[PDB]
Design a protein around this ligand. Structure first.
Ligand SMILES: NS(=O)(=O)c1c(F)c(F)c(SCCO)c(F)c1NC1CCCCCCC1
Ligand SMILES: NS(=O)(=O)c1c(F)c(F)c(SCCO)c(F)c1NC1CCCCCCC1
Ligand SMILES: [Zn+2]
Ligand SMILES: [Zn+2]
Lengths: 239, 239
């Protein structure tokens, strides 16, 4: 896929001392994310990640009139004691990373948005090890054994998607880049939360040790290597 | 057009004290703006403005990965003893204003870009009275008599289109807004230069006193009223 050799790819290393503070970056607005138990949601092992299909009505704004609808979320992870986040911070790789993918409300279809500036926006958060079991993540992690096989799927009860995300929606980094998988389309607005979310070590081991990929392989280390900024400046919403 | 009643319209009153310094805003870059004299360009009195249609190969970048192609430029002006810029600065209206309209390289056509985030980008500079005849502007202004009638046009030799803009491409305001004529589509990135361009009093009088519009009326005061920011924050490339 020649687009994977484009100049403005993701993921990148975030170097906060080189980030550009702009006070124009307002707190993220996420409405309609508190889903009721029904209808249930499709959870799928697609061989590259585990992907949760989101329903209509999850509305997100990166700014005044810059609105988005959530399509899906998925994760990137490592292996036994090996971190697998996509973004890094000053060369540090975190245990895992969640991506919530959104479509601009200026586009009816994903295929129209691919390669167009701001057509797609991803909310990204690092997952770290903490002492407590995370209830929000347990709702998904507890269903991975059902979909251990590549290509399998199941249905899960609706859940509060926003509970999967960090505490402070006013503190993030932002830049324009690409999908981290083929077709590697550019024009994707990446927003990476400053703060992380915590999962227990058992939960992180469950994420990385349960699913199978293409052939006899485990579905692990499903992250792309770091790409150069090529002159892009990462913005920060805080001084 | 219902988009002329959107919340996020242009032009606006720029209040520099309320602008957000964003050091991610680097100097604008232009390529191919220095045209040979042939082929000639078309200069049209369209009844709302005087418009110069630009040829293919004029590239503009707002930053790394934010690439555009120039389509046309046009002017907004007042009348004898009355300023007619569209944008204002702290309530001050300037004698006239130039707009150079560009299409994102993600779109083959204007109608695909309308209403899409960053689909269109305009470079705007204020025109003020200086002591000298501006020789680049004289190439256009010396032809207005040929196109005095509404709907008339004439061919003009190619020229250095960048010579109609300020030499300082580092200091500017930037915000997201709309077209200022129907359909008033939103998603337009407006860049307004700090530095102004100087025309002689005679040039400014030629601009405002030569062209006729729709009816038996002079084409004058062809600016839209300022529109509220409505919570948008204007960014500045300098503190
Ligand atoms: N990080 S990411 O957002 O680029 C991304 C992956 F890395 C993946 F591994 C996957 S799963 C495998 C599908 O090829 C994914 F769906 C998304 N997101 C999809 C978003 C919708 C756009 C087209 C389909 C592929 C990317
Ligand atoms: N300020 S502006 O950029 O909105 C604008 C005017 F104010 C005008 F008065 C005009 S005059 C002719 C159209 O009625 C104009 F062409 C443009 N620009 C055109 C850009 C070309 C692409 C969209 C089609 C029309 C707007
Ligand atoms: Zn991803
Ligand atoms: Zn205009």
């Amino acid at each position: 896929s020649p687009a994977c050799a484009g100049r403005f790819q993701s993921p990148v290393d975030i170097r906060p001392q080189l980030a550009a503070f702009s006070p124009a970056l307002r707190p993220l607005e996420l409405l309609g994310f508190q889903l009721p138990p029904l209808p249930e949601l499709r959870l799928r092992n697609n061989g590259h990640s585990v992907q949760l299909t989101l329903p209509p009505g999850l509305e997100m704004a990166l700014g005044p009139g810059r609105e988005y609808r959530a399509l899906q979320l998925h994760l990137h992870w490592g292996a036994a004691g090996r971190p697998g986040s996509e973004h890094t911070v000053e060369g540090h790789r975190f245990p895992a990373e969640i991506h919530v993918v959104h479509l601009s409300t200026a586009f009816a279809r994903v295929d129209e948005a691919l390669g167009r500036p701001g057509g797609l926006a991803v909310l990204a958060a690092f997952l770290e090890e903490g002492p407590e079991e995370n209830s929000a993540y347990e709702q998904l992690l507890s269903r991975l054994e059902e979909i251990a096989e590549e290509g399998s799927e199941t249905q899960v009860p609706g859940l509060d998607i926003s509970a999967l995300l960090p505490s402070d929606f006013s503190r993030y980094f932002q830049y324009e880049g690409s999908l981290t998988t083929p077709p590697c389309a550019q024009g994707v607005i990446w927003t990476v939360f400053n703060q992380t979310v915590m999962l227990s070590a058992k939960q992180l081991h469950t994420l990385s040790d349960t699913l199978w990929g293409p052939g006899d392989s485990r579905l692990q280390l499903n992250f792309r290597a770091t790409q150069p900024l090529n002159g892009r400046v990462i913005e920060a919403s805080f001084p």
